[PDB]
Ligand binder design. Sequence first.
Ligand SMILES: Nc1ncnc2c1ncn2[C@@H]1O[C@H](COP(=O)(O)OP(=O)(O)O)[C@@H](O)[C@H]1O
Ligand SMILES: Nc1ncnc2c1ncn2[C@@H]1O[C@H](COP(=O)(O)OP(=O)(O)O)[C@@H](O)[C@H]1O
Ligand SMILES: Nc1ncnc2c1ncn2[C@@H]1O[C@H](COP(=O)(O)OP(=O)(O)O)[C@@H](O)[C@H]1O
Ligand SMILES: Nc1ncnc2c1ncn2[C@@H]1O[C@H](COP(=O)(O)OP(=O)(O)O)[C@@H](O)[C@H]1O
Ligand SMILES: [Mg+2]
Ligand SMILES: [Mg+2]
Lengths: 60, 64, 62, 60, 61, 60
Amino acid sequence: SLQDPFLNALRRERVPVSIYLVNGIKLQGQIESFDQFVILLKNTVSQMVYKHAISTVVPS
Amino acid sequence: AKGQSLQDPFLNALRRERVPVSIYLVNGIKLQGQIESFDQFVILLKNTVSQMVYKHAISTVVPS
Amino acid sequence: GQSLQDPFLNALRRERVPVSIYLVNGIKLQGQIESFDQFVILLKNTVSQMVYKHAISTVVPS
Amino acid sequence: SLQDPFLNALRRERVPVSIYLVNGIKLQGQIESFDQFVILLKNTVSQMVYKHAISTVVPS
Amino acid sequence: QSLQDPFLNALRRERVPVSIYLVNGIKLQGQIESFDQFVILLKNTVSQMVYKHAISTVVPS
Amino acid sequence: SLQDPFLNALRRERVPVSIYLVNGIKLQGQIESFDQFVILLKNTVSQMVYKHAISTVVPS
RNA sequence: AUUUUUUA
Ligand SMILES: Nc1ncnc2c1ncn2[C@@H]1O[C@H](COP(=O)(O)OP(=O)(O)O)[C@@H](O)[C@H]1O
Ligand SMILES: Nc1ncnc2c1ncn2[C@@H]1O[C@H](COP(=O)(O)OP(=O)(O)O)[C@@H](O)[C@H]1O
Ligand SMILES: Nc1ncnc2c1ncn2[C@@H]1O[C@H](COP(=O)(O)OP(=O)(O)O)[C@@H](O)[C@H]1O
Ligand SMILES: Nc1ncnc2c1ncn2[C@@H]1O[C@H](COP(=O)(O)OP(=O)(O)O)[C@@H](O)[C@H]1O
Ligand SMILES: [Mg+2]
Ligand SMILES: [Mg+2]
C-alpha cells in the first residue's frame, strides 16, 4: 500500500490538507484517522468522509 | 488504521448516543436525523420516518 | 447488527407502501416495490422498471 | 435473480426500451444482449453500455 | 464476459474507429489498442488509458 | 494487467501526464507511484488521487 | 460475507 503510509504521515504530523470530493466540493482540515473505507477529517468538528466520495487528498 | 476500526465505532457512537446527524450525499443534498441502525452497506436514518440510505451515496457523516 | 436491506425492502413490498426511490443524481422515482435481488429493485408504477442498486441513494416511504 | 429474467424478457419480446444513465442521458433501443457487466442496446447501431453507468431500464 | 470481450475484441482486431462516451458526457474517439478487466487503451494522436468505471458506452463511430 | 505497465512506463520515464477526473477536472504532474487504489501525482506537491475518481491518464 | 477505496 502507498495509500496507508501517505495518510499516516499526514496524520502524524498534523499536515493541513484539502480533500476534493468527486462532486467538486473542497473540504479542509487535518487527517485525524482513516480505515479501509473512510477518512476522519477534523477542522472545527470531526467528520467521517467516505473514500468513494473523494477524488484527491492534497497537502499544503 | 485497518478494516472498520474507525467507521463502525464512529457510527455506533452516533447510534448509541442518539446524536442528531447530518448526512451529506454525493449530489450535495444534506439529510438530517438520527442513526437508527446500519450495516456494511446501508444506514437507516430516522427523522419523521425511517429511510434506507446506501453508503455509496454518502459523502460525509457529521454530528449536526 | 445483521443485514438491513432485504428486511426493509420486504416490509415495504409486503405492506404495499408507496415509496420514493431517490437516485444518486437526485431523480425521484415513485411506485411500489415489486421485487428485489442482490443488484436491482423492480419498482412498479405505470410500468415495471428495473433500478440498479448502485444508482440508488435512498429508499423511503412517500 | 430478477435482473436476468427482466432483461431476457425485453430481449425476447423485442420491446422498445429506455435506458437511463446516471448522468441523466436517456438511451432508446432494443435489448440485444447482456452479460455480467454490460448491456448491448440496438437502435441504428449496437452500442455497449456498462451497467455501472445505468440507473434504470424502463419499457418505453 | 461472453458479450463484452468479443465486442471489444472485434473492434480491436478489425481496427474499427470507436467512440467512447464517458460518464461526464465527454466523447473520446480513436481505435482500441488493447484492454484488460479494468481499462481500455485508446489510440488517437496518442495512447490514453481509460478506466471502465468512467465509461458509459462504447460504439463504433 | 495493462494498467500497471502503462503507469510504470510513465513513472520510470518521468513523463509529464494529464489525469482527467470524472468531474472533468484536469490534473497535471508526474506519476511518483501507484497501487491498487491510488496514484501519487507530483507537481508543486505530492497529492494522492483515488483511481475511482479518474477517467483517463494520458501523456501531456 | 447483498459492489461500504474494486469492469452489475
Ligand atoms: N462534506 C460534504 N459532502 C458533500 N457536500 C457538501 C459537504 N459539505 C458541504 N457540502 C455542500 O456544499 C454546499 C455548501 O455547503 P455549506 O453551505 O458550507 O454547508 P451547509 O449547507 O451544510 O451549511 C451545500 O450544498 C452542501 O450540501
Ligand atoms: N435522499 C435523497 N437522495 C438523493 N436526492 C434527494 C434525496 N432527498 C431529496 N433529494 C433531491 O434533492 C432535491 C431537492 O429535494 P426536495 O425538494 O426536498 O425533494 P422532496 O420534496 O422529494 O424531499 C430534489 O431533486 C430531490 O429529488
Ligand atoms: N450512445 C450514447 N451513449 C452515451 N451517451 C451519449 C450517447 N449519444 C450521445 N450521448 C451524450 O449526449 C450528449 C448529446 O448527444 P448527441 O446530440 O447525440 O451528441 P453526439 O452527436 O456528439 O453524440 C453528448 O454530450 C453525449 O455525451
Ligand atoms: N480524456 C478525458 N477525460 C475526461 N474529461 C476530458 C477528457 N478530455 C477532455 N476532457 C474535458 O473536456 C475539456 C475540453 O477538452 P480538451 O480541450 O481536449 O482538454 P484540455 O483541458 O486538456 O484542453 C477538458 O477541460 C476536460 O474537462
Ligand atoms: Mg446477512
Ligand atoms: Mg465501489
